[PDB]
Amino acid sequence: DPAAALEDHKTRTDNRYEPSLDNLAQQDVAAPGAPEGVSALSDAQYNEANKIYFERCAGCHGVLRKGATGKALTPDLTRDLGFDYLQSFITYGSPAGMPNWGTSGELSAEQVDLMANYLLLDPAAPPEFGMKEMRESWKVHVAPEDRPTQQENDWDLENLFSVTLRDAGQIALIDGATYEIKSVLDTGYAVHISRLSASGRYLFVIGRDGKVNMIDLWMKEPTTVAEIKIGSEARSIETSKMEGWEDKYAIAGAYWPPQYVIMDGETLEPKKIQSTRGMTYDEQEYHPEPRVAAILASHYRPEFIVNVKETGKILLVDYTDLDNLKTTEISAERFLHDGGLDGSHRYFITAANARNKLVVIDTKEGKLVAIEDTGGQTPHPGRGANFVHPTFGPVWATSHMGDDSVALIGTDPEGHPDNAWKILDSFPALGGGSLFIKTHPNSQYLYVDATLNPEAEISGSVAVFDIKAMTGDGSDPEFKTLPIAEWAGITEGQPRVVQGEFNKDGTEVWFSVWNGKDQESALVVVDDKTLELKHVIKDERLVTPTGKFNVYNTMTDTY
Amino acid sequence: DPAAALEDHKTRTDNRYEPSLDNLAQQDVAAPGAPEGVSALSDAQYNEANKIYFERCAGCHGVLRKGATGKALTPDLTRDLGFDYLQSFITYGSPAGMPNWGTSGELSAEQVDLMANYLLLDPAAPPEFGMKEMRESWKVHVAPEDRPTQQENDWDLENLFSVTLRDAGQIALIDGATYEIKSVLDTGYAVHISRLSASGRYLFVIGRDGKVNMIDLWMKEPTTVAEIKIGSEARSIETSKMEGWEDKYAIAGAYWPPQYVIMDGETLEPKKIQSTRGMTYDEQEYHPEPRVAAILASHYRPEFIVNVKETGKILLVDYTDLDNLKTTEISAERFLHDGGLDGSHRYFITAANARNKLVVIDTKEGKLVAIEDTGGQTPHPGRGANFVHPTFGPVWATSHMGDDSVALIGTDPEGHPDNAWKILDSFPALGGGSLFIKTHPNSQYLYVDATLNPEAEISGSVAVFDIKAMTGDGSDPEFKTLPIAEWAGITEGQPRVVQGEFNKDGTEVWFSVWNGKDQESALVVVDDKTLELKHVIKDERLVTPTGKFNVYNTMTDTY
Ligand code: DHE
Ligand code: DHE
Ligand code: HEC
Ligand code: HEC
């Protein structure tokens, strides 16, 4: 029944965070031939359909149509369903993308037909992106020997914030104490995250288009000193954080092609490219499009920690020898996305989001130690929030996209054995659609956003729990509601509050008030001691501000 | 121009040993649609061309046409060349496969046109073969609990020879001392090799079609106790050989899909499937069809040693934990095929045949040690031949398919450091087309076949060098020529002599006198001490005898 689309394709609070391959969609593709019994699309029609598919459908169904969160839509299957079924199903409407920039999930009649016909044709695989292509894109603007040998600006680099100005393809370096926008740097395409080298000198950004920029914070006027392209679609980057390996390497992960690349930490020279195509951990079936999700760096061994989504594998990649490459491929759970290290920096706790699980890896021993259901729908921790719960001991927290719950997992196998790797508590925050939870060692507060909630009141606010007041009686902890968007004084369009990030001292917490590109946005700085508004950052240049990364907290993995 | 096929597409003595995917060629395929400027082939024409392509062309160019020893033939490239060029180039034909079963490489006018047209169309990837498929094929005929707990027959198992009866889909178990055929067992179509568990109890055979049979030699009447299919095309299998891991695991390698599988050593239960799709070691470019070639077992660590051909990677796979899987991916040289361990069983020495190199791996340290050109064309060692050269010390030898040369490499870094991993000598044997070189610790002789030589007398004889007389003075060591085929007394055809294999005591060496399926074949047993004919084995059941494996010498890697 084609009417099943109403439920399958319904927009929910937890199905909007699937990849939109809008960079890859720009590539012009030639129309394939049509086998007997199938009508062909012209080159123009096929290219129009392909762009739509990559922008709106490929996230869930795959660019190769072999399935991701949504099932496979290969020609064998679609031809059995037939044109009529496809046309009907697609007419209902697809799940919306992210707010402000994402798709609405609605198509015209002409487009519906293009899509149905497109699904009946044999898709070609998008171009690969290997060493030759990377080296062609590789530019070293300032060779290492020509860079400063000491900080040449008067900035307090450790208290600096690197803020994504999403739609503009820029980042803003903002002073953590004065709130001054020190510089607005251009990278071209939208930046997804900022990461810092272990010394705090080098700022790495990765564009959604696979473009990596490395910026030297020691220059009188910090700018990009090197750049490289590592794929067509990418969302993750990290730096080497094992003691003794400071500034040695950076690693980038791609959605397409399915691969990760280890680069020289000073020049960005591409050193080792690894494909992530392989077998799913459980059913052990070949998957041709296993996207790289979060990438973290071990503090216990000279390794990178790479999440491979569709196959449910966590890779521990040893960068001490790139020719005789040692890896540990850990069978985990499918749909790995984001995660973080516990307070001790030994255990990697990551969300296998579509399956509602937290997977725990011991980075010292290189083995899986636990897989636990959070009891919530679609956990999305970011890097999560570590704190010492007054009665449970060390815990790590996550909120959820699919419900209002916050779950705590014990992270102290030696010191609180019974509590270790068990969900110790689950309680409600503002509402569903949460993306980020945050705390800091110098704070007694736990902040939870609700970015994707359908209610403006909730999406524009943040829940704050008092950790010192938590008891363990099983009751639900009370929270204070901070009216972040209201504080910023922007009601136009629909601002969505997203992601808490602390200053170096942990005395102030920043939130992004994310509005559309032609609308007014802001950053809101909250005084952590009083839970009152401290400062509002507004500027005509502050377009679609999303991710914010404090240099010190990012370089040290303090969360 | 098209006339360049006289050099690249004609039969050489060293280009007949590329994969013939004749099992995969039996699968029916769907005829693709054709884009503008290209003409479609009917279902029959496309399948006729596909069968020809898989059997004759895919070995060198790949089923996906991304290139192997021959260049890529993807539609983008072939359409630029055009039909006329393709037609003219293919009119010359293609290199012949193996004698007694392989293709002649001759094409009719109609077939030439089909192939040219096929190359202009978009190929589909053959079906994958994962856990679901393996488990459906997995049959345990005699559970472990129902098997004997001690040897229940009176055979001398360690002196048994397991002989491939290629075209009959059987193996013969032959008494090493009496030459009695103890049993003929049904297996996969054309068993490629036999391998033994470390205890010598279990006999594993793999057919070219990917079928694996496990035989319990302790039964009163040895038979298949378990079977499984691991792919569509496969050539390699090995057992765990690290002390303490006897009989724990078996591993099988496949050409298609490009993968290896680790199985339970007692039941054949498929435990871990690993894709070998990935990046080439040198150019670091994605390769969609990296075939698994030889697989050996480490004696120093609990690891399997897997050659991945097209990407030039040697994998050291640790089987102590299949869930948190540790591997070492060693960048080596492209076109890895066969090889063996040195006399100490520490170093793996393998031929990157198409590049005329020997790659050396230290299995204790898990690292590449050396890569050296043999000075010959297309080295094909089998497992090679280890001996103590009177002047040079411990050496490992290989012969070549492309010329008559035998090369020696020093294998003793500790005792003979100046000779270690250097090509110490190169001298002629009977002629080109050699496949196997052989010796044994108790023998003073080095045997070299010339199986693929185009001269009947040469292909039916073996060269034998006296190791004791070798001086390494730069002169060409003399050799005795044993007229093996003549000794067998076969009137019909021109049988080819292949592969020496010793008995357990190393006093007798066996050769196969390989004739066609409907022709007369034999096994010839030579007395090693005198170099005289010991026995001729003929039986109506001895159809197309090829590989022969002594239980003791195979379980212990004595070569
Ligand atoms: C794989 C991945 C990571 C982990 C990175 C790492 O470990 O270095 C991540 C992290 C993130 C983080 C990391 C926060 C942290 O504290 O580590 C942030 C702020 C973030 C803000 C957004 N992400 Fe993200 N994000 C994706 C993927 C990912 N996002 C998408 O596939 C997706 C859903 C859509 C897309 O096509 O890009 C998507 C949309 C968004 C947004 O619409 C967000 C809210 C705003 C924006 O700038 O695009 N993502
Ligand atoms: C990958 C591989 C190995 C290593 C096995 C291992 O490590 O377990 C091998 C070993 C072998 C060995 C191992 C000898 C040893 O002492 O280890 C033998 C006897 C052998 C007899 C043949 N091989 Fe072999 N062989 C191939 C591949 C291989 N052969 C081919 O791709 C090829 C060229 C063609 C094909 O499509 O199969 C091919 C044709 C042949 C033959 O025509 C032979 C001579 C006879 C036959 O039975 O088919 N191959
Ligand atoms: C993620 C939230 C999705 C996006 C974006 C789109 N689809 Fe999807 N689709 C999704 C689900 C969860 C399902 C149900 C089956 C499952 O995997 O659990 C589907 C189903 C379809 C189908 C039905 C095929 C069938 O065999 O019944 C079709 C034809 C389909 N989807 C097409 C499609 C297109 C063209 C999209 C872009 C507009 C699209 N989907 C977006 C999840 C998601
Ligand atoms: C291995 C021995 C081969 C087999 C079997 C076949 N081909 Fe081949 N081919 C091989 C080589 C070494 C070369 C030359 C280029 C190189 O890789 O060094 C080729 C070339 C071709 C071409 C020419 C393409 C061009 O760009 O000029 C074609 C069209 C081609 N081969 C087709 C082809 C077909 C149809 C085969 C089966 C009958 C076939 N080849 C077998 C090596 C080998």
Side-chain angles (χ1 to χ4, degrees):
Chain A
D1 190 343
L6 287 168
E7 294 68 44
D8 303 345
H9 272 207
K10 178 179 177 181
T11 294
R12 308 195 304 285
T13 63
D14 63 349
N15 71 351
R16 305 183 68 174
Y17 202 80
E18 297 305 319
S20 177
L21 313 183
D22 53 0
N23 180 57
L24 186 61
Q26 299 184 138
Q27 293 185 359
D28 292 320
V29 299
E36 190 164 35
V38 179
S39 302
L41 288 179
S42 68
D43 282 334
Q45 291 172 317
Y46 190 80
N47 223 118
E48 184 179 339
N50 189 71
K51 180 180 183 298
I52 298 168
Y53 185 79
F54 280 24
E55 296 184 348
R56 313 191 184 194
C57 314
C60 290
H61 295 285
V63 290
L64 303 175
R65 309 218 292 280
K66 293 294 298 182
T69 52
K71 67 183 298 179
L73 301 177
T74 46
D76 59 314
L77 301 172
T78 62
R79 287 167 193 165
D80 284 352
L81 295 171
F83 178 85
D84 291 349
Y85 178 90
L86 300 168
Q87 182 191 50
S88 296
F89 198 98
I90 298 173
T91 298
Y92 289 99
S94 60
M98 292 292 281
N100 295 320
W101 65 270
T103 180
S104 60
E106 291 303 344
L107 287 176
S108 75
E110 180 208 77
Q111 290 173 334
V112 171
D113 288 354
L114 288 177
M115 293 323 94
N117 286 311
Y118 174 90
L119 291 177
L120 292 168
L121 297 167
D122 294 287
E128 291 291 327
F129 203 94
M131 184 66 72
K132 177 183 177 181
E133 295 68 32
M134 292 183 194
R135 287 179 172 280
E136 288 176 326
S137 77
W138 177 46
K139 303 170 184 176
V140 177
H141 303 289
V142 188
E145 41 288 323
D146 298 329
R147 304 175 189 167
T149 53
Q150 67 186 108
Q151 183 181 341
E152 292 185 356
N153 61 62
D154 70 359
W155 301 13
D156 179 353
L157 295 179
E158 291 183 352
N159 204 36
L160 193 74
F161 287 68
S162 179
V163 181
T164 298
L165 305 187
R166 196 189 180 286
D167 294 25
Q170 297 166 340
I171 57 170
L173 303 181
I174 310 181
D175 190 293
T178 69
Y179 321 112
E180 181 181 25
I181 295 174
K182 291 298 206 162
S183 182
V184 173
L185 299 176
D186 287 71
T187 75
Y189 285 74
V191 164
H192 210 71
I193 56 148
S194 293
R195 292 285 175 269
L196 276 295
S197 73
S199 66
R201 174 173 181 178
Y202 293 115
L203 171 61
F204 292 84
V205 293
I206 185 156
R208 299 173 59 270
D209 67 334
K211 179 65 62 63
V212 176
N213 279 272
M214 72 169 288
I215 293 156
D216 184 359
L217 297 176
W218 279 17
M219 301 172 68
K220 183 179 180 177
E221 298 186 340
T223 193
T224 296
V225 295
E227 63 180 272
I228 194 167
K229 180 177 174 63
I230 60 84
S232 296
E233 293 287 339
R235 303 296 180 276
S236 58
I237 189 156
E238 187 53 302
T239 60
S240 50
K241 295 181 179 168
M242 178 66 200
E243 186 175 328
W245 294 85
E246 298 81 6
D247 285 305
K248 289 296 182 179
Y249 293 113
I251 181 171
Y255 286 177
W256 188 271
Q259 62 191 27
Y260 65 85
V261 188
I262 296 174
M263 298 162 284
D264 184 286
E266 290 172 2
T267 66
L268 290 182
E269 188 184 348
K271 303 299 288 187
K272 194 73 165 193
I273 306 165
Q274 295 286 301
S275 170
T276 54
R277 288 167 229 213
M279 312 299 283
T280 60
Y281 88 93
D282 50 357
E283 305 294 19
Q284 304 199 56
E285 168 190 10
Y286 181 71
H287 197 297
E289 197 174 335
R291 296 174 177 149
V292 176
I295 301 171
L296 283 74
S298 179
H299 293 255
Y300 274 73
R301 307 200 303 198
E303 290 176 338
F304 290 121
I305 306 164
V306 183
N307 274 350
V308 187
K309 183 182 296 298
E310 286 78 3
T311 50
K313 305 290 182 65
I314 300 167
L315 315 182
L316 301 180
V317 184
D318 180 316
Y319 51 72
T320 66
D321 186 341
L322 302 178
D323 298 320
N324 308 291
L325 187 78
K326 294 182 62 179
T327 70
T328 305
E329 173 191 306
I330 298 175
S331 290
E333 178 61 284
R334 300 186 72 197
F335 304 110
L336 293 166
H337 191 65
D338 48 353
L341 304 172
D342 74 300
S344 76
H345 286 165
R346 175 172 172 172
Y347 303 93
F348 172 55
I349 306 163
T350 182
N353 65 17
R355 290 182 174 184
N356 306 328
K357 302 299 190 289
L358 294 177
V359 173
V360 185
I361 304 303
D362 179 350
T363 71
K364 183 185 184 184
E365 297 301 328
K367 295 185 190 295
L368 184 143
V369 297
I371 303 180
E372 294 295 320
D373 196 286
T374 65
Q377 296 297 133
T378 317
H380 186 277
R383 288 162 291 151
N386 293 293
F387 61 94
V388 183
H389 185 286
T391 69
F392 295 137
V395 300
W396 175 104
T398 185
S399 55
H400 294 79
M401 281 183 38
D403 67 34
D404 67 9
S405 73
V406 176
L408 310 180
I409 191 169
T411 65
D412 187 11
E414 295 189 344
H416 292 75
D418 275 342
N419 290 351
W421 317 120
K422 286 169 53 185
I423 304 301
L424 308 176
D425 204 357
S426 180
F427 48 85
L430 279 178
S434 184
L435 292 176
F436 301 98
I437 188 159
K438 205 72 184 188
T439 194
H440 187 274
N442 292 333
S443 172
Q444 72 185 90
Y445 299 117
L446 182 65
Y447 300 81
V448 190
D449 63 30
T451 313
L452 304 179
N453 196 277
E455 282 282 9
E457 292 283 90
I458 294 172
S459 67
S461 298
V462 173
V464 194
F465 298 86
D466 185 349
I467 293 163
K468 286 187 175 185
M470 293 176 178
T471 60
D473 53 12
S475 71
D476 296 334
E478 301 179 19
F479 58 85
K480 179 177 189 63
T481 301
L482 308 184
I484 303 301
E486 179 197 306
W487 285 341
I490 317 159
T491 58
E492 93 157 294
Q494 181 179 45
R496 286 171 185 283
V497 173
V498 65
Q499 189 219 23
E501 177 71 350
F502 286 80
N503 61 359
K504 176 180 176 309
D505 296 323
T507 58
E508 294 178 4
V509 65
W510 294 33
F511 294 95
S512 305
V513 180
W514 174 35
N515 222 337
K517 69 177 301 173
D518 295 313
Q519 297 169 313
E520 188 180 35
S521 292
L523 310 182
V524 169
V525 183
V526 180
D527 182 331
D528 175 79
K529 292 290 191 301
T530 64
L531 299 181
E532 292 172 350
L533 174 64
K534 169 70 170 181
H535 179 81
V536 181
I537 300 171
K538 283 174 172 174
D539 193 294
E540 177 265 17
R541 298 171 293 173
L542 196 84
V543 176
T544 63
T546 52
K548 304 161 298 300
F549 302 94
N550 168 260
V551 170
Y552 190 83
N553 296 333
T554 307
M555 60 181 296
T556 61
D557 294 339
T558 299
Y559 49 78
Chain B
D1 72 299
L6 292 175
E7 180 188 22
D8 294 316
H9 256 216
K10 295 287 79 172
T11 304
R12 292 175 182 289
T13 68
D14 56 348
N15 72 355
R16 307 186 62 167
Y17 204 81
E18 300 309 318
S20 177
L21 311 182
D22 51 2
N23 182 58
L24 189 62
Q26 298 182 336
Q27 294 182 0
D28 55 11
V29 293
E36 207 295 326
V38 180
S39 294
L41 290 177
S42 65
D43 177 71
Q45 296 177 309
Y46 193 82
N47 276 271
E48 183 178 353
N50 194 79
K51 176 178 183 300
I52 294 169
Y53 188 83
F54 279 33
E55 294 181 350
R56 313 191 190 192
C57 316
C60 297
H61 294 285
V63 301
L64 306 174
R65 309 215 295 276
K66 282 293 186 176
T69 52
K71 68 184 297 302
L73 297 176
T74 47
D76 59 320
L77 302 175
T78 62
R79 292 167 187 166
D80 285 344
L81 288 171
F83 179 86
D84 292 347
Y85 170 85
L86 297 172
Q87 182 185 52
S88 298
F89 192 98
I90 301 173
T91 296
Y92 289 99
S94 57
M98 296 291 292
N100 295 334
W101 72 264
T103 185
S104 62
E106 297 177 8
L107 297 170
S108 60
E110 185 173 300
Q111 293 175 321
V112 172
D113 290 359
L114 288 178
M115 301 311 302
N117 284 314
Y118 173 90
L119 294 182
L120 295 167
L121 296 164
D122 297 283
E128 292 291 328
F129 200 96
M131 185 64 73
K132 184 179 182 58
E133 296 68 36
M134 296 183 191
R135 285 180 174 279
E136 187 281 338
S137 79
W138 178 47
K139 300 166 191 172
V140 178
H141 304 306
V142 188
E145 61 276 13
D146 299 320
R147 301 176 194 166
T149 53
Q150 62 186 292
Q151 187 183 340
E152 291 185 357
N153 60 62
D154 64 7
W155 301 13
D156 179 349
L157 298 179
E158 291 182 352
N159 202 38
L160 203 69
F161 284 68
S162 180
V163 183
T164 296
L165 306 182
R166 188 184 185 288
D167 301 23
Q170 296 177 319
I171 59 165
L173 304 178
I174 308 182
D175 186 303
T178 70
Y179 321 112
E180 290 167 282
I181 297 174
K182 304 300 288 181
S183 179
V184 175
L185 295 172
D186 293 331
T187 64
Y189 174 55
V191 166
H192 212 75
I193 65 156
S194 293
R195 290 287 175 269
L196 277 294
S197 70
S199 65
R201 174 173 180 178
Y202 293 117
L203 170 62
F204 294 84
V205 293
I206 186 158
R208 43 187 25 262
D209 70 332
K211 179 58 59 183
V212 178
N213 287 237
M214 172 186 181
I215 294 152
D216 184 0
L217 300 174
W218 280 14
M219 294 178 67
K220 175 177 169 300
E221 302 180 356
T223 188
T224 292
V225 296
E227 63 178 86
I228 196 170
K229 183 179 166 61
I230 60 84
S232 303
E233 292 287 344
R235 302 295 182 278
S236 57
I237 188 158
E238 185 55 303
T239 58
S240 51
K241 289 175 175 172
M242 176 68 194
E243 181 172 7
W245 295 84
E246 301 82 1
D247 299 354
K248 293 298 161 295
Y249 294 113
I251 179 177
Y255 285 172
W256 191 272
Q259 63 189 27
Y260 67 84
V261 193
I262 296 176
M263 299 162 288
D264 185 286
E266 296 175 3
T267 66
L268 290 179
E269 184 180 358
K271 303 297 296 190
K272 195 72 167 193
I273 306 167
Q274 295 289 125
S275 169
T276 54
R277 269 106 166 192
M279 313 296 284
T280 58
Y281 88 93
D282 52 358
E283 295 184 36
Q284 304 197 56
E285 172 186 16
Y286 181 71
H287 199 293
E289 196 173 341
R291 295 169 183 150
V292 176
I295 304 173
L296 283 70
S298 180
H299 296 219
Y300 275 70
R301 304 188 305 195
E303 284 172 348
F304 290 120
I305 306 166
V306 180
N307 278 348
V308 188
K309 190 173 299 293
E310 286 80 0
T311 51
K313 306 292 182 67
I314 300 168
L315 315 182
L316 302 179
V317 184
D318 182 314
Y319 50 71
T320 69
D321 189 337
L322 301 177
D323 300 312
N324 306 294
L325 185 79
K326 296 184 62 288
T327 68
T328 306
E329 172 195 303
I330 299 175
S331 287
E333 178 61 285
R334 302 186 74 198
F335 306 111
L336 297 164
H337 190 71
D338 50 351
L341 299 170
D342 75 299
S344 72
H345 295 108
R346 176 171 170 174
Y347 303 92
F348 174 54
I349 307 170
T350 181
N353 63 14
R355 292 182 171 185
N356 299 336
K357 305 292 189 289
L358 294 178
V359 175
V360 182
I361 303 306
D362 180 347
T363 74
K364 185 186 175 184
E365 299 300 324
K367 293 178 191 58
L368 175 72
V369 169
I371 304 180
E372 292 303 327
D373 194 291
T374 64
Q377 299 296 140
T378 318
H380 185 277
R383 288 164 291 149
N386 293 294
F387 64 93
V388 182
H389 188 285
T391 297
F392 301 134
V395 300
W396 177 100
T398 184
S399 57
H400 295 75
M401 289 188 296
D403 63 34
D404 63 11
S405 75
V406 172
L408 309 183
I409 192 170
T411 63
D412 182 16
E414 283 297 317
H416 297 81
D418 296 335
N419 290 348
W421 319 125
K422 297 181 181 175
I423 305 301
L424 301 177
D425 205 355
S426 181
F427 48 85
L430 274 179
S434 187
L435 293 174
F436 303 97
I437 189 159
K438 205 78 190 185
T439 196
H440 187 278
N442 289 332
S443 169
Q444 73 184 94
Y445 297 115
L446 184 66
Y447 301 80
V448 189
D449 64 27
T451 311
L452 304 180
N453 197 278
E455 189 172 291
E457 202 76 273
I458 294 180
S459 65
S461 302
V462 300
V464 190
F465 299 86
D466 186 352
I467 294 163
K468 286 190 171 189
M470 292 179 182
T471 63
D473 65 3
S475 71
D476 292 339
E478 304 176 274
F479 59 85
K480 292 222 313 164
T481 301
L482 307 185
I484 303 298
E486 186 185 328
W487 287 348
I490 300 176
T491 297
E492 66 190 320
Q494 300 70 223
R496 291 166 182 277
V497 172
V498 69
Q499 191 222 13
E501 175 71 349
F502 282 80
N503 60 356
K504 171 181 170 185
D505 293 345
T507 55
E508 295 178 0
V509 59
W510 295 36
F511 294 94
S512 297
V513 185
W514 174 34
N515 224 355
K517 175 186 173 188
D518 304 318
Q519 300 171 296
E520 183 184 19
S521 293
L523 311 177
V524 169
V525 181
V526 181
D527 177 68
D528 177 79
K529 303 301 188 188
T530 61
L531 298 180
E532 295 175 1
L533 173 63
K534 174 63 177 183
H535 193 81
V536 178
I537 299 170
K538 287 183 179 182
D539 192 290
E540 287 303 300
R541 299 167 296 171
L542 195 86
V543 173
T544 57
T546 51
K548 307 159 297 299
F549 301 92
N550 170 259
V551 167
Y552 189 85
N553 297 338
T554 308
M555 61 185 288
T556 64
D557 297 338
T558 299
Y559 49 78

